[PDB]
Design a protein around this ligand. Structure first.
Ligand SMILES: [K+]
Ligand SMILES: [K+]
Ligand SMILES: [Mg+2]
Ligand SMILES: [Mg+2]
Ligand SMILES: [Mg+2]
Ligand SMILES: [Mg+2]
Ligand SMILES: [Mg+2]
Ligand SMILES: [Mg+2]
Ligand SMILES: [Mg+2]
Ligand SMILES: [Mg+2]
Ligand SMILES: [Mg+2]
Ligand SMILES: [Mg+2]
Ligand SMILES: [Mg+2]
Ligand SMILES: [Mg+2]
Ligand SMILES: [Mg+2]
Ligand SMILES: [Mg+2]
Ligand SMILES: [Mg+2]
Ligand SMILES: [Mg+2]
Lengths: 231, 101, 567, 49, 197, 325, 140, 132
RNA sequence: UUGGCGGUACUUUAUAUCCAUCUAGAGGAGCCUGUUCUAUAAUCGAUAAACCCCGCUCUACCUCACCAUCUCUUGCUAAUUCAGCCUAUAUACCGCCAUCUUCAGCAAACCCUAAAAAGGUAUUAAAGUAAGCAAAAGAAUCAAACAUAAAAACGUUAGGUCAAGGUGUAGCCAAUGAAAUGGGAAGAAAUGGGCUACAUUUUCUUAUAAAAGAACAUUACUAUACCCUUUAUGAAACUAAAGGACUAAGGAGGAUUUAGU
């Protein structure tokens, strides 16, 4: 019946099944598609031509009249649209370059860009941000049981002596990246470099239970340090 | 296409009752009285019985015109309670509002 | 009670800013799209009638039901032929008529005449229609006419009319001769076609030709047939060919029209005007005065459709007024158009825009600017969306009244009517604004207008790969910026003369120098010298010497200025 | 008349003057299902002989 | 092929001394581009003002009276005066009307929205006459009152005949007049069985 | 991840244009309604908009409005610092510059009164402004603790010797309590064709409504709906309810009442008459007596009416039996 | 229009017949609507129109009617939980007096053609006529 | 919890129109009725037939102007005249709207045997009452 | 560390509510109705609070989805190797709700911590801030208030509903589809809710609920059961009402439990 037909928004809402108990139960998956994407108003399977809707209203000074395409002409148009569908579908398939950090499946050592502009258009394009750890911590709650947050440790620096770090926590990873990235720009140390390429002297220290033993080295020695220290 | 095969059977019952309305009226009148001989009344009792069963107007059921629901219908709109609430709760019925008092 | 809304588009067009027709081309295109959508619905209704058959309207509305044009009577009988004739199918009716003759079944003479009417009127061709013609010697119409056993006056008359309609003048006249030989009598409609035939045919001698047409009129009285309006209108329409010799005959006809009791219609005067005021009239020195008498005769009268040339009258009358440069007469003609419902006879799409365009142009030329602006607001856009030349006439009128303060406003109006990118219009606006000096406030307003007209050139340049900045607009836009507190912008525009390789004019160059002296900026003064050197203008050297005396030049400036002087 | 509405709107959809989001949705589910090999069998050739 | 640009609203060109009846000659929907008023409608959000006219569905949902303004109604009624006819001056009171026109015929019309103009209630007609206006002898009035039963009201002395049995209103109207004529003539007739009361 | 429309703060040029469009709106609305623009007022505007845009929405905030921009647009708090960035007020960095600027003044006043050194009830029947009113005066938001402290400081000022300057100051924060006149509205005294005085009043109990017509002089003859009161009211308790008004004022056998009660039952009709007689008898008693009636319950309408039944419940309050488990 | 104005606007032809005109002693117009404000605006338009044509009019508000019904809120079970709906009808009665049949047709057309959407009219004309000529004289 | 015609809260990024924002209990209080006919007034007939026409007329306009509707349409019945007032986005060219108006009017006048008119107010984009 | 829990103390608590107080009930009899059980060739769903006069504001045929028998095979539509499916999964969903609940929170952007898994209040103030949703306000019950309704976020119960309709996946396509006719039974059974009675503040009659005259324990009170007649609806009485007699049990109900400010 024509009266039991529902709109596209309501059809995809049910079919996708995003809302529901499945989402909280961790449940490739079906992909929403727009069916009006390539459809032109006035174009039908029968191939009629409607002046002023899907064809020119006047052609070479002649007022057009209603017409229909031949079976051969319509078959071409139908096949042409089928091709245009394949072209659009292929676009989604493409996967493009990114750079891995310390490992392919880890965020550690991945550049996420500069911090956001400041209050008075203070750009930080000369600063780069690097991820040092991404953790999925959990807090038990009565409402949700186990609730998950993303704790991200990032570092920032301009490669010219100024650097800082911060931790950002959120429920979404993208938000934790923004929080840490813009927080770290507020904790910028200035580090003294001997001739711009090394530390001024050997440095040994213990921070809590971590021990670090740095050594001053000549030019061309390169960075021979923990991957995080290299970052 | 109608909503379902049940609405289709109901539609045919409604169109066969309209065809047999005068006939079932004239014959049934001969039975609903005490003025005519009982022999005629006993015979009219069978002429009305012989008519097709779907001519009988008590086999019609009022169903929601849009969902074909047999019960829960409101006769002024011919819609089920579920369909009526969807149109009413969206401001699409002219003058229907929620009752607060 | 209600009158036309002066600030609204015609009622046909949708009342939305996005859907209001900006130009005259969109006006016709928008209506054709509306008519096209109406035809798309009527096609679906007439092709799937089973879905448009339930009738829920009390009283019943016949005009909202599906139409059926194909015969539904299958049996081959005189009645079935009558149906096809009523439906106006020409080929199918001929087949069933021949089949009736093949069987030999009787066919009524009246029914046989209804077939000839359809064939004669449509000239053997199926009625024109839209969905997914000379007379032919061997055709169904003439063949059926011969097969007819019994002939009557109507039968011959139908042939005479159909032949004349389909340009068979010579044959039609021959058919009339037979009607006289049979001693039958023709009707008024047939006499009108015969007169239309003699006129269309080219006769060597006018005097013979006129005496022939009169002979048809004399036989109209012998046969006790009284003439109608069309009869006289047809004769006058024929007389428009002989402008010189048709004047005395034409007046006599109109006098005879009143004596008979036929009332001259707007069409009847449309022909007398054409005959007395030729469009290609070399003798404009002393035109005729008849137009004044006609308007006096028709003053205050109301007219109704009674001919097919009634619409033509109003468009022609205004044209004669514009030729005579009489604005009082134009008001009388327009005043006649407003009486009663005469507005309905202004004309169709081709003639409606000519009448008002001719009318408004005459107002601007010969009317006070104060009144001219009243007419401007009333007619536009409600009546007609004018072409750009109308605005050039309005702008020129403002210049002649010394009211150039309104030129910026006219520009804003023009943009709504799709003249934003019109080169001719943009050049007129800038030219008048920058033709002479003005008080500071007016110059500032003109400068804002000049900036707006500059944006049109700029946006057009960006969109189009190949764009040329016309030289005169560049001078006008630059001068206006200097005069209106936009000198900084004018210095940037100085570079555009070199980018587009346009030769700066001597006046503009010295104007830039005058402003520089007041500013006291030697650097800016030297900038003018740079451009003069580029185009090798002779005055450039004199201008460089002028800078030397106007400003104190630093030693660095002396070297830089000397280089440019050498260049 | 449910037959008039369902038929009339179907005819309009084939003329390009009406768009049925529901039908276009179903037309693509059938297209995809046929590719997967779950399409409707032909009559008389069902799984049971 | 850039997108089309909408023109500025035509309210900008409207003078404050315009002929508004011409702007809205007949009932039309609210057009924000034709109504030169800064009207706002909508329950405002916190720290917000009511919504503006452009794109306002609530203003569109209103049956506006812009076409009916005090200036229009007076200009309309001035034209409609030629249609009207003058009530006879002599009939200055209701009692005066009962004297010369004792019969009251009630007919009802119904106006609704829909494709059908048909209403079942429009056929009914009601005749009301006072027995005092009728020329009735002492015998006749008693016979008229017994026959009509509850149609007669002693308090008001009014006979009410309501006829809806016939399909059309012209038939029901003629039937009620017929019912009165038969009752009147029958009331005057005296039957022999009446002597046994 | 905040992506919602920001506050569309209204600049002075914005509100200035909104006032020019409103001024042009009035001239058009006046021309539509055929009135004179010069005299057209806010009251006429509201009436015109209600005619031209009939809306029957119950909430009147949601109805069409063509009001002055000042009334609709909230007053924008002005910038608190200049171009150099220096705040205009010395208490800007407190976060409540206006609350603390006011508390600074009142504390300085208190100190001078205490250093420098009669009945304090200069104003009576007044209240301290509520927090919402104070917030408007300060053009800022306060907490409940901020209001409580402000009042305590103002009270201390009143305790101390106060010159006329202080009395004017504390006046600003005292709002005249519009104590309602909880007193009877005495009815007029009409006169009949005979010339006797009589008063009339209506009464409503439950669904019953009565219209009594007490007469100044009578022998105690009460007629209800043209019937006697012993006949109409066969129950003693209903007659006692009619006795209560007169017995209270010791006016038995001195008035003649004519009642007309329609609706309700026997008890609801006696109660409606009791109120109708009490309100009519007010015109024939002293003002001290009228207060005696009002304070004994004779002049108060009874608001107790039957409560609607609830869906899913046996009655107004009765519930369905909670089924055994 | 500032300068361009119609000259002699065409007006409909009204021809006086020789038939006598109907005489309506009363003419009650009961308008109904869900909205009170629409009735107020229509009442003003109708009363103004009557006063401009010379008709005598009175207006009152018959008591409003509210029709309420209950439905089941859930799609399945949960009987005790319901939802209630109501339809409100409001009335304005325009009682006209002493109208000829020509005045009542022009007035009713003018006000019926301007009847807002959602508004229903119930005209109740009360004609007054003489007695039937047969009834006038008793005939045996 | 009540789920009827309530556009639920998200994270402040969901634009909602005035019609969508208000739940059913605000009908006749803050928002009016989209259709106005006389068929639900007391002592009036043909409510069922007016209601069925509304359902169809709304589905017809959605398909005939696909993606071009800014808000729900408003249906106004006066006498036998039907008036459709639709807020439409300015996506389509101007001439296409003239075609669809002529088509949709003629088609619906021959389907319901009444005079049907289409009134289109074009908006630059959907009007957002609040972000919820 | 956070949550949860504790037959761990401490303080404050529910407002027809945990106990207590008050009134009428339920639990006993008779019936009406749901459910389970038993059972039938013969649906489905709900089935602790939050099912049990529930989906049904409603089943003699129809409704109907069930069982038995016979029959149809392009089998509603403009077209379609297509139509149709009350076929499985509510643990894929939309839609529309229940429950906590008239509970007071929820989520977004920030800021702070000798590091942060998380936490963030003190008013004579000690690191928290400023917007959104809910509550509040407002509107409705046509003066006023109060009250009652309505409203009530995020979540909890993979809560309810593939049988309102729609729909993802899987399945049937001479059958899991379509249609006709006839059936869908009952109970020494348990249980939930209702109705009526058990009487004297009662029974019958006139009245109008005031008053009066009779009745008043073996059938006096007391059968909406069974049975017997008549009427209403219908084609069909198997239904409902009204009379008639027949009349059995019941004598205020064990623990226990429901509702009412
Ligand atoms: K669900
Ligand atoms: K089957
Ligand atoms: Mg890898
Ligand atoms: Mg189905
Ligand atoms: Mg039934
Ligand atoms: Mg109770
Ligand atoms: Mg309790
Ligand atoms: Mg059955
Ligand atoms: Mg069956
Ligand atoms: Mg099945
Ligand atoms: Mg679930
Ligand atoms: Mg609850
Ligand atoms: Mg309130
Ligand atoms: Mg609330
Ligand atoms: Mg479950
Ligand atoms: Mg289940
Ligand atoms: Mg009693
Ligand atoms: Mg029977």
């Amino acid at each position: 019946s024509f009266f039991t037909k529902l709109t596209a928004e309501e059809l995809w809402k049910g079919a996708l099944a995003e809302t529901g108990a499945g989402a909280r139960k961790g449940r490739k998956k079906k992909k929403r598609k727009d069916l009006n994407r390539g459809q032109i108003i006035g174009e039908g399977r029968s191939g009629f031509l409607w002046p002023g809707l899907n064809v020119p209203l006047i052609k070479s000074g002649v007022v057009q009249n209603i017409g229909q395409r031949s079976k051969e002409e319509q078959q071409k148009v139908e096949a042409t649209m089928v091709e245009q569908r394949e072209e659009w579908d292929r676009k989604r398939k493409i996967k493009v370059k990114r750079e891995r950090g310390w490992s392919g499946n880890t965020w550690g050592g991945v550049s996420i860009g500069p911090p956001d502009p400041g209050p008075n258009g203070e750009t930080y394009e000369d600063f780069d941000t690097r991820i040092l750890e991404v953790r999925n911590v959990f807090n038990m709650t009565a409402k949700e049981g186990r609730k998950k947050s993303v704790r991200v440790l990032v570092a920032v620096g301009n490669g010219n002596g100024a650097a800082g770090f911060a931790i950002g926590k959120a429920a979404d990873r993208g938000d934790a990246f923004r929080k840490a990235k813009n927080r770290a720009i507020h904790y910028l140390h200035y580090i003294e470099r001997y001739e711009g390429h090394t530390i001024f002297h050997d440095i040994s220290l213990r921070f809590k239970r971590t021990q670090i033993r740095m050594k001053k080295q000549p030019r061309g020695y390169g960075l021979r340090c923990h991957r995080a220290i290299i970052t | 296409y109608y909503v379902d095969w049940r609405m289709l059977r109901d539609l045919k019952r409604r169109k066969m009752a309209y065809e047999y309305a005068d006939e079932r009226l004239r014959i049934n009148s001969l039975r609903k009285n005490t003025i005519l001989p009982k022999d005629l009344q006993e015979m009219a009792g069978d002429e009305i019985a012989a008519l097709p069963r779907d001519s009988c107007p008590v086999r019609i059921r009022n169903r929601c015109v849009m969902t074909s629901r047999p019960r829960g219908v409101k006769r002024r709109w011919r819609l089920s309670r579920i369909v009526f609430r969807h149109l009413a709760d969206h401001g699409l019925l002219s003058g229907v509002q929620r009752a607060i008092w | 009670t209600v009158n036309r809304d002066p600030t609204a588009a015609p009622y046909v067009f949708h009342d939305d800013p996005y859907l209001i027709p900006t130009s005259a081309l969109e006006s016709r295109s928008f209506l054709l799209a509306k008519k096209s959508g109406e035809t798309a619905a009527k096609f679906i209704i007439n092709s799937y009638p089973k879905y448009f058959q339930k009738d829920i309207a009390e009283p019943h509305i016949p005009c909202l039901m599906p139409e059926y044009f194909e015969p539904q009577i299958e049996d081959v009988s005189e009645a079935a032929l009558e149906e096809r004739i009523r439906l106006r199918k020409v080929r199918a009716s001929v087949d069933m008529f021949d089949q009736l003759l093949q069987a030999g079944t009787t066919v009524s003479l009246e029914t046989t005449n209804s077939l000839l009417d359809l064939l004669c009127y449509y000239g053997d061709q199926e009625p024109p229609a839209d969905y997914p013609g000379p007379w032919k010697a061997q055709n169904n119409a003439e063949r059926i006419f011969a097969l007819m056993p019994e002939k009557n006056a109507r039968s011959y008359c139908t042939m005479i009319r159909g032949m004349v309609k389909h340009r068979a003048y010579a044959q039609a006249l021959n058919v009339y001769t037979e009607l006289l030989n049979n001693r039958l009598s023709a009707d008024v409609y047939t006499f009108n076609a015969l007169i239309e035939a003699k006129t269309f045919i080219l006769n060597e001698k006018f005097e013979e030709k006129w005496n022939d047409i009169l002979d048809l009129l004399k036989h109209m009285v012998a046969q006790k047939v009284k003439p109608n309006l069309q009869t006289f209108n047809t004769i006058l329409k024929g007389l428009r060919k002989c402008y010189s010799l048709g004047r005395i005959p034409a007046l006599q006809i109109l006098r005879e029209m009143k004596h008979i009791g036929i009332e001259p219609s707007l069409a009847t005067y449309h022909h007398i005007i054409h005959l007395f005021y030729p469009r290609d009239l070399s003798a404009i020195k002393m035109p005729s005065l008849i137009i004044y008498d006609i308007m006096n005769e028709l003053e205050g009268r109301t007219f109704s459709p009674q001919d097919l040339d009634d619409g033509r009258f109003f468009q022609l009358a205004m044209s004669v007024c514009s030729s005579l440069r009489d604005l009082e007469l134009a008001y009388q003609v327009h005043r006649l158009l407003n009486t009663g419902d005469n507005r309905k006879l202004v004309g169709h799409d081709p003639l409606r825009k000519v009448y008002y365009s001719k009318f408004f142009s005459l107002i601007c030329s010969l009317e006070q600017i104060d009144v001219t602006l009243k007419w401007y607001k009333d007619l536009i856009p409600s009546v007609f969306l004018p072409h750009y030349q109308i605005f050039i006439g309005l702008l020129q009128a403002l210049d002649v009244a010394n009211r150039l303060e309104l030129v910026p406003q006219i520009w804003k109006d023009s943009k709504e009517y799709s003249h934003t990118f019109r080169d001719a219009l943009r050049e007129e606006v800038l030219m008048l604004m920058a033709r002479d000096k003005h008080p500071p406030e007016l110059q500032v307003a003109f400068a804002d207008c000049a900036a707006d007209i500059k944006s049109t050139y700029e946006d057009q340049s960006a969109r189009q790969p190949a764009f040329d900045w016309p030289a005169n607009p560049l001078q006008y836009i630059a001068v206006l910026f200097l005069r209106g507190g936009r000198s900084q912008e004018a210095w940037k525009m100085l570079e555009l003369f070199k980018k587009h390789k346009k030769i700066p004019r001597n006046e503009l160059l010295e104007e830039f120098m005058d402003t520089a002296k007041a500013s006291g900026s030697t650097a800016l003064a030297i900038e003018v010298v740079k451009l003069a050197s580029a185009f090798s203008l002779p005055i450039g050297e004199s201008l460089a010497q002028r800078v030397v005396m106007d400003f104190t030049v630093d030693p660095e400036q002396k070297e830089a200025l000397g280089n440019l002087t050498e260049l | 008349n449910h037959n008039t509405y369902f038929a009339l709107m179907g005819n309009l959809r084939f003329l390009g003057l009406y768009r049925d989001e529901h039908q276009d949705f179903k037309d693509e589910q059938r297209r995809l299902k046929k590719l997967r090999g779950k399409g409707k069998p032909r009559k008389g050739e069902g799984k049971r002989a | 092929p850039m997108r089309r640009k909408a023109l500025p609203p035509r309210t900008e060109k409207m003078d404050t001394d315009q002929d508004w009846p011409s702007v809205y000659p007949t009932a039309a929907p609210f057009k924000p581009s034709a109504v030169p008023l800064p009207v706002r409608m909508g329950y405002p959000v916190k720290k917000g003002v009511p919504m503006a006219k452009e794109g306002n569905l609530e203003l569109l949902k209103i049956p506006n009276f812009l076409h009916l303004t005090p200036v229009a109604i007076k200009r309309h009624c001035a034209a409609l005066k030629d249609f009207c006819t003058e009530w006879p001056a002599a009939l200055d009171s209701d009692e005066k009307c009962e004297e010369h026109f004792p019969v009251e015929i009630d007919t009802a019309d119904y106006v609704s929205s829909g494709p059908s103009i048909r209403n079942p209630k429009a056929r009914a007609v009601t005749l009301r006459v006072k027995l005092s206006s009728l020329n009735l002898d002492n015998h006749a009035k008693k016979k008229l009152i017994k026959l009509v039963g509850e149609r007669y009201c002693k308090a008001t002395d009014v006979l009410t005949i309501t006829t809806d049995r016939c399909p059309l209103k012209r038939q029901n109207y003629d039937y009620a007049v017929y019912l009165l004529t038969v009752l009147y003539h029958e009331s005057w007739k005296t039957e022999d069985w009446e002597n046994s009361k | 991840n905040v992506q919602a429309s920001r506050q569309e703060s209204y600049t002075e040029d914005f509100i200035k244009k909104q006032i020019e469009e409103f001024n042009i709106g009035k001239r058009h609305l006046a021309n539509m309604m055929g009135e004179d623009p010069e005299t057209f007022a806010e009251e006429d505007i509201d009436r015109a908009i209600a005619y031209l845009f009939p809306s029957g929405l119950f909430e009147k905030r949601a109805r069409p409005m063509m009001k002055h921009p000042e009334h609709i647009f909230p007053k924008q708090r002005a910038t608190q610092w200049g171009e150099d960035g220096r705040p205009f007020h010395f208490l800007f960095y407190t976060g409540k510059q206006s609350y603390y600027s006011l508390m600074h003044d009142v504390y300085g006043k208190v100190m001078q009164l205490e250093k420098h050194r009669a009945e304090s009830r200069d104003l009576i029947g007044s209240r301290w402004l509520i927090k919402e009113e104070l917030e408007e005066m300060l053009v800022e938001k306060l907490s409940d603790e901020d209001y409580a402290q402000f009042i305590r400081l103002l009270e201390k000022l009143l305790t101390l010797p106060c010159g006329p300057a202080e009395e004017e100051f504390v006046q600003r924060f005292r709002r005249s309590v519009t104590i309602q006149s909880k007193k009877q509205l005495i009815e007029p005294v009409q006169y009949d064709e005979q010339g006797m005085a009589f008063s009339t009043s209506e009464g409503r109990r439950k669904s019953a409504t009565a219209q009594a017509v007490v007469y100044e002089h009578g022998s105690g003859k009460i007629h209800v709906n043209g019937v006697d009161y012993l006949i109409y009211f066969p129950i003693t308790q209903d007659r006692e309810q009619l006795m209560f008004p007169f017995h209270f004022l010791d006016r038995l056998e001195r008035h003649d009442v004519t009642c007309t009660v329609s609706g309700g039952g026997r008890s609801a009709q006696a109660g409606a008459i009791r109120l109708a007689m009490a309100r009519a008898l007010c015109s024939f008693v002293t003002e001290d007596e009228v207060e005696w009636m009002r304070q004994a319950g004779l002049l108060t309408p009874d608001p107790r009416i039957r409560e609607r039944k609830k869906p899913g419940q046996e009655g107004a309050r009765r519930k369905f039996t909670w089924k055994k488990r | 229009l500032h300068v361009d104005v119609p000259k002699d606007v065409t007006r409909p032809t009204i021809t006086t017949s020789d038939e006598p005109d109907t005489l309506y002693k009363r003419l009650s117009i009961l308008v109904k609507a869900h909205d009170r404000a629409v009735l107020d605006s229509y009442e003003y338009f109708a009363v103004l129109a009557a006063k401009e044509l010379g008709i005598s009019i009175k207006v009152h508000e018959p008591p409003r009617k509210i029709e309420r019904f209950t439905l089941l809120k859930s799609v399945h079970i949960f009987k005790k939980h319901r939802v209630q709906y109501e339809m409100r009808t409001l009335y304005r009665c325009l009682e006209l007096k002493h109208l000829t049949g020509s005045t009542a047709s022009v007035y009713l057309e003018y006000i019926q053609r301007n009847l807002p959407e959602g508004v229903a009219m119930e005209v109740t004309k009360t004609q007054i006529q003489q007695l039937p000529e047969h009834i006038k004289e008793p005939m045996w | 919890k009540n789920r009827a015609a309530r556009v639920r809260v998200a994270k402040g990024n969901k634009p909602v129109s005035y019609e969508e924002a208000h739940a059913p209990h605000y009908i006749a209080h803050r928002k009016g009725w989209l259709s106005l006919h006389t068929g639900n007034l007391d002592g009036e007939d043909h409510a069922a037939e007016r209601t069925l026409e509304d359902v169809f007329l709304r589905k017809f306009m959605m398909g005939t102007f696909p993606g071009c509707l800014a808000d729900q349409i408003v249906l106004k019945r006066r006498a036998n005249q039907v008036d459709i007032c639709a807020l439409v986005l300015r996506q389509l060219p101007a001439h296409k709207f003239y075609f669809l108006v002529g088509y949709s009017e003629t088609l619906l006048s021959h389907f319901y045997k009444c005079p049907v008119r289409l009134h289109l107010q074009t908006v630059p984009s959907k009007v957002v009452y609040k972000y919820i």
